[PDB]
Amino acid sequence: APLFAGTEHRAIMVDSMLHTVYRLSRGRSLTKAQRDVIEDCLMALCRYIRPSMLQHLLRRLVFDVPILNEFAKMPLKLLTNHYERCWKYYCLPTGWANFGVTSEEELHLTRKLFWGIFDSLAHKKYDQELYRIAMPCLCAIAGALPPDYVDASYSSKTEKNFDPRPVETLNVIIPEKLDSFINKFAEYTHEKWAFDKIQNNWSYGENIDEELKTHPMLRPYKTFSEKDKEIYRWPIKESLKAMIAWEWTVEKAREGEYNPQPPDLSVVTLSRELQAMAEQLAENYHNTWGRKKKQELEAKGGGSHPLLVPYDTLTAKEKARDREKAQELLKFLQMNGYAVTRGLKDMELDTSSIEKRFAFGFLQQLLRWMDISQEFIAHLEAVVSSGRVEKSPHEQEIKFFAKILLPLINQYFTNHCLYFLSTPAKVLGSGGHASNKEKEMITSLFCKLAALVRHRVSLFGTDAPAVVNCLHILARSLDARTVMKSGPEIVKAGLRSFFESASEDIEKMVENLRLKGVGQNLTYTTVALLPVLTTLFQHIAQHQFGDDVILDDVQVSCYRTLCSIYSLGTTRNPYVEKLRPALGECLARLAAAMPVAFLEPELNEYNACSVYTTKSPRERAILGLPNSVEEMCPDIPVLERLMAEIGGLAESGARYTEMPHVIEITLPMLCSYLPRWWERGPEAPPPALPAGAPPPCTAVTSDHLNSLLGNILRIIVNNLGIDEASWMKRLAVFAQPIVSRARPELLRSHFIPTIGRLRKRAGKVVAEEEQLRLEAKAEAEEGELLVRDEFSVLCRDLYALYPLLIRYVDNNRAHWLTEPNPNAEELFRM
């Protein structure tokens, strides 16, 4: 098989071999071992053949696979491997390197394959193996398809062992006016064919003969034998009868624009609905022609024609003959004045490229399935509440949802995250950006899934992790700024409702902890809401959507969440102790994302992104907002008091057990808050200082950041060397961002003593290890565990303190190398 790479010079032979092997695979009287061998051969061939050469096999599979019968299992695996291997050849605008780029026909076939498999699976009865095989194939095809691909031959009607079944045209009658048109079109076809035989050097002769080179039937119409003339017409009569059979109408009332003199048909334009008519009519011709070959094969007793595949599947060049000559017939109808009526076709012909995008269609289907999911989840809740013993009528829908849509959503929005976050001004991905409609639809999907899973983690059972992962991915893929600034009121209300419900649930959890609906709320919160809310806040902060998203009602809900979490953090319960890390991370992300300096309420008047500025004083009265921003909720101390308390604890040398709230919640919140407002406060790099600039809404400075870093280092040093401290890694991760603003004096004041203590401890432990190795038998065997534990705690301390040192060194190394520094040299020694 590997030798088949680069065989494009024998593409016809390779295609014939592939088709023959596939036909053998679909073989009766074949033992299981023989079928396995054939399938292995086919997969090996497709693993190495170039993607451009598998187009015809793909065309066959487009028809065969969507049936999803027993024979469809191997093609599913083949397509999965093929698209996983060659996703670049289809997705990237440049295509796969050295392999070219896909064609529009190949993309159309891929889209047809995806939607056929999707619909068949959606309507199929559940089967474990079928679903397991099919889901990866759908994921691979979706990943290969470009999100913004638009099908040139889009079809809203979407009509429909190949059985070509043309419409019955012989039965339908032919009007006399259409008979007149039949005569005129017969004359025109006579003229065009006469031009052609003049090209061939044939003229009117007595009898047909290749050597004689004269066609007897070619002659003037008046002298043309009447018997041959309706033989000439009959294809046209059959065509028109078929048109009438489809309820297509033509009325000559209005008018529109031997020697061969056929009027040129190319000059006259052709409408797009007319083009679709021609495509359908050529489809019927292909049906009749395939029916003729089907009768031939039936007479033979078997066999399959190579071109028995559907007309739409046939690429452009193969369609060309029938398409063009149907164009000719319809055009002549036009010059005779026969403009055919559309009806269903013309009210189907609508929409735009945005609505034709593959991602648009996929998201629309996902939203419809979200509605279905809401319905069957309500039904499942009802049956659980009463009539516990019964069989759900939505078993198939439940299984399809859980075992297809969730993995599919996860994979698809992992792959195409950057496409949905891109904007016309700034493009993040390789190419293309989601439209406003697509962004709104993905926002609606996220909100609907969150509402679905709310207070139902137990109900979802083993699928709750999948739902939560999908929510994570959707949040990471959400573009909230565009949706909030310019989006439908319904989508905006959905997002606002999500935030309000999150705040309410967190308040309920907080009050319950302070002291089974309680259990339901607790499990839901800690399992789905806090992680998903943390991810959403982190995404907002990373993409700087805070100023545009968290405003007005969202701002009020964020206030409630923030200070309810802060109030909870003060209590002392085993459950609170277990929950503090997650609450601290959520508060850190919320503080990074908030657009209002909630720790500096005295400067709020200068904040443009504040509810007390955006909403008039008459407003905020229909809401329950208090008169002054200070009273939003006062339990959170101001920045000065917070820093004073942190410094006091650090100097007093308290251990972790004496301030679990501070270390786990307050310090991460400050570490996320101070960097955010340093850029917007004084001392920041001013882009607008030359122009009129309002006073900053914050007083944060490098002094504040340096003081916080010093206090954090002092706290770590105070807790150095204790038996158990799992909070050190979290504190180091949270404090890493503030290191960039540290002052040079920190090296001598804090870092040198700390690393000195660590070095002294390491020296002591290695000395003890040497003494142990000097010892023997039980003396060495016991105490090895003791020095093991000492090394473990030393490694914990080193990993707590070294990331901060690494950031400090990265920021200050240039200065040290430029100017020799004895303190830096001492640090190097340690």
Partner: protein, 48 residues
Amino acid sequence: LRFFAICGLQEGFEPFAINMQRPVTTWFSKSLPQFEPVPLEHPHYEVA
């Protein structure tokens, strides 16, 4: 050199033209079309 001391000097890298008594000569891709013999291994064109 503006950043050689900060990175490269201690790592042991040497400036490209450190011990050259004359500036390094340079060539550039001139976009003036010129006639050249057809290569004997041109992928697309063959002359017999």
